[PDB]
Symmetry: D2
Subunit: 149 residues, 4 copies
């Protein structure tokens, strides 16, 4: 059920800022190269492709900060306990991205294919190699795993 969200170009992973097992609400999601249980994710299916990206350790899920239905470019991604249909994402493992219900994608802030550790993540409509993500085994960061099962 658990997987790592790996920035495709850099090999860094999605983390709660601070890497806590229980991040506070509205904790920013960053990219970091470390692997540990506090950066594992799960995907709770809600409606076919749509569901919640769940931080495994805490159970909080990925939100655009503020929870708007149509967040603008550069809206920061955070973890928050609330469940609602503005926190709906799809894990596009064919095109290798993470898309929000309103159509923008998870990006590293600043759009780099080699973002340093602690780089924030934001929503943005653009499509390029720096917004690509693959979903891999916690025991083997190079083995893709099916997030939907």
């Amino acid at each position: 059920t658990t997987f790592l969200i790996k920035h495709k170009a850099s090999g860094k992973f999605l983390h709660p800022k601070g890497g806590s097992s229980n991040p506070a609400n509205d904790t920013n999601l960053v990219l970091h190269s470390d692997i540990h249980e506090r950066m594992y994710f799960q995907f709770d299916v809600v409606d076919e492709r749509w569901g919640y990206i769940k931080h495994a350790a805490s159970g909080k899920i990925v939100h655009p900060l503020g929870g708007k239905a149509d967040p603008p470019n550069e809206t920061k991604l955070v973890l928050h306990q609330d469940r609602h249909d503005r926190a709906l994402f799809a894990m596009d493992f064919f095109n290798d991205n993470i898309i929000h219900k309103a159509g923008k994608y998870i990006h590293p802030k600043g759009g780099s294919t080699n973002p340093p550790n602690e780089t924030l993540t934001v929503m943005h409509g653009d499509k390029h190699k720096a917004m690509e993500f693959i979903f891999v085994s916690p025991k083997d960061k190079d083995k893709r795993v099916l997030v939907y099962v």
Copy 2:
């Protein structure tokens, strides 16, 4: 695994075994037909992340390019066959709305029409366009997309 219909997106016709038998013979052609019934239900058996077997639910037989070659050429017919091996691996791309073979070609209606008539055969072809799009829907509601990977 979830049961679903394979619906040609532009026309609304569905993937069927030729003749619509509950136990198609090996190498029975896969065709498009407008009817819905239990003998055109499919399932998807995951083998390796995105890759798996497109399984005819009534018979247990799975989708093959005729002849089972690793890299089948354009116009290779799709058929049902009991054998399981890695040349019968497909992925159900429900984001781009197609069915892609392990070697990179897609399931097409033979002739590539967006309105193929009943009994039109299906073939492998590398082209991507409107006429090779498929969506995966509920046997109870042909307009409701369902998740085939669980």
Copy 3:
């Protein structure tokens, strides 16, 4: 200045139906494998990429039948003497297609990559291998030529 409009997948060319030096107004544009002076074309630049696709022998130009600004899918292509901005096209020699001012493309009617002789042409929004065209020398149908100079 003169070039052939070659259906990229089949090698057939754009012709006035009947192959006449002076096609009547609203004569259909068809695909035919023959080469001769009555299927030569020119391009009259009007505004950067936009211009008139001119039948060389007659001076008539390519119109969507009826001259509408936003012709629907399957609108037939014809030759007509009139000049106006609803007959504006662009010769996209990078993506290999012919695009109308309102954004649809010249297609073989029926969308075949191997259309028979006398197949009509129509406007259609779809993009695929059967709507591709390249622009070649009247003396060598495999030598691309610049239509904008």
Copy 4:
């Protein structure tokens, strides 16, 4: 025949570094917001879509530094007097980019959609909004002009 090479996302233009009427061989090509006669370009057609990107004031043309047929990502763009088929580019005014004979594109170094003045340019194969260019009138930087005539 003369035009400005405008970075589409930022509005900055291609310049010879230092802005000289006679840049020395292997002078870097940079982006800068100024307009003046020493950043005007022309395009000398050689083979259909392929030609030389000519600095109007000096007559030198755009090269990948070193003039190799298949330059790698991050090869700097410069001006050089020599004319040969490794300095062949095409001005894709449909997809809005500048492509080299071997298939890579002119990029701002660093791939920003808002590169600051003096940012160098390099070859890179990636396609995204930061490598888009449009070609405009020296008298009106928003009016696209046909570079091929």
